[PDB]
Amino acid sequence: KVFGRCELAAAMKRHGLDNYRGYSLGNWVCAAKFESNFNTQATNRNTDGSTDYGILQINSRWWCNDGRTPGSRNLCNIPCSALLSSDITASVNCAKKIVSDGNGMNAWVAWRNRCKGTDVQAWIRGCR
Ligand SMILES: C[C@@H](O)CN1CCN(CC(=O)O)CCN(CC(=O)O)CCN(CC(=O)O)CC1
Ligand SMILES: C[C@@H](O)CN1CCN(CC(=O)O)CCN(CC(=O)O)CCN(CC(=O)O)CC1
Ligand SMILES: [Cl-]
Ligand SMILES: [Cl-]
Ligand SMILES: [Cl-]
Ligand SMILES: [Gd]
Ligand code: NA
Structure with a gap:
C-alpha cells in the first residue's frame, strides 16, 4: 500500500505514535x-x-x-x-x-539526516 500523507498521520495517531517518547506526530x-x-x-x-x-x-x-x-x-x-x-x-x-531502547529516532538514518532540527510540523499541516 502507498499511503497518502494525512491518511498515514491519522493511522499513526490512532495507534498511539503521536508524542511517543516525546516525539511529535510530524517526526x-x-x-x-x-x-x-x-x-x-x-x-x-x-x-x-x-x-x-x-x-x-x-x-x-x-x-x-x-x-x-x-x-x-x-x-x-x-x-x-x-x-x-x-x-x-x-x-x-x-x-x-x-x-524506547536508548538511541531514540536516531535508529532511522533518514530521520537523523533529513528531519532532525527541521520544521517537522510541516508534515501534518492541513490534515484534520
Ligand atoms: C499537492 C500537489 O503538490 C500535487 N502535486 C502537483 C505538482 N507539484 C506542484 C506543487 O507541489 O506545488 C510539483 C511536484 N511535486 C513537488 C513536491 O510536492 O515536492 C511532486 C509531486 N507531488 C507529490 C506531493 O505533492 O505529494 C504530486 C503532484
Ligand atoms: C512544491 C512543494 O511541495 C514544496 N515543498 C514544501 C511544501 N510542501 C508542500 C506540500 O506537500 O503541501 C509541504 C511540506 N512538506 C510536506 C510534504 O510535501 O510531504 C515537507 C517539505 N517538502 C518536502 C518534499 O517535497 O518532499 C519541501 C518542498
Ligand atoms: Cl508535529
Ligand atoms: Cl529521545
Ligand atoms: Cl534468519
Ligand atoms: Gd512538500
Ligand atoms: Na532476525
Whole structure:
C-alpha cells in the first residue's frame, strides 16, 4: 500500500505514535516519507546480509525473522513479511520497542539526516 500523507498521520495517531517518547506526530510522518516513500511493501538489502522491511524500514538484524540473516535476533517476535502489510499495526508496535531502547529516532538514518532540527510540523499541516 502507498499511503497518502494525512491518511498515514491519522493511522499513526490512532495507534498511539503521536508524542511517543516525546516525539511529535510530524517526526514519524517525516521518517516514513524518507525511509519508504509511504510504501508498506518497500525492502532494501544492507551489505552485512540483513534487510530493512516496510514503511519504517525495520532491520532483520535485531527486530524480525526472514530465515536468511544468520545468528540474528527477533525482538518483535514477528516474521519480516508481517511488516509489509497494508495494516501498519505490526510496524507501529515494532517501532515503539526500537525508539524506547536508548538511541531514540536516531535508529532511522533518514530521520537523523533529513528531519532532525527541521520544521517537522510541516508534515501534518492541513490534515484534520
Ligand atoms: C499537492 C500537489 O503538490 C500535487 N502535486 C502537483 C505538482 N507539484 C506542484 C506543487 O507541489 O506545488 C510539483 C511536484 N511535486 C513537488 C513536491 O510536492 O515536492 C511532486 C509531486 N507531488 C507529490 C506531493 O505533492 O505529494 C504530486 C503532484
Ligand atoms: C512544491 C512543494 O511541495 C514544496 N515543498 C514544501 C511544501 N510542501 C508542500 C506540500 O506537500 O503541501 C509541504 C511540506 N512538506 C510536506 C510534504 O510535501 O510531504 C515537507 C517539505 N517538502 C518536502 C518534499 O517535497 O518532499 C519541501 C518542498
Ligand atoms: Cl508535529
Ligand atoms: Cl534468519
Ligand atoms: Cl529521545
Ligand atoms: Gd512538500
Ligand atoms: Na532476525
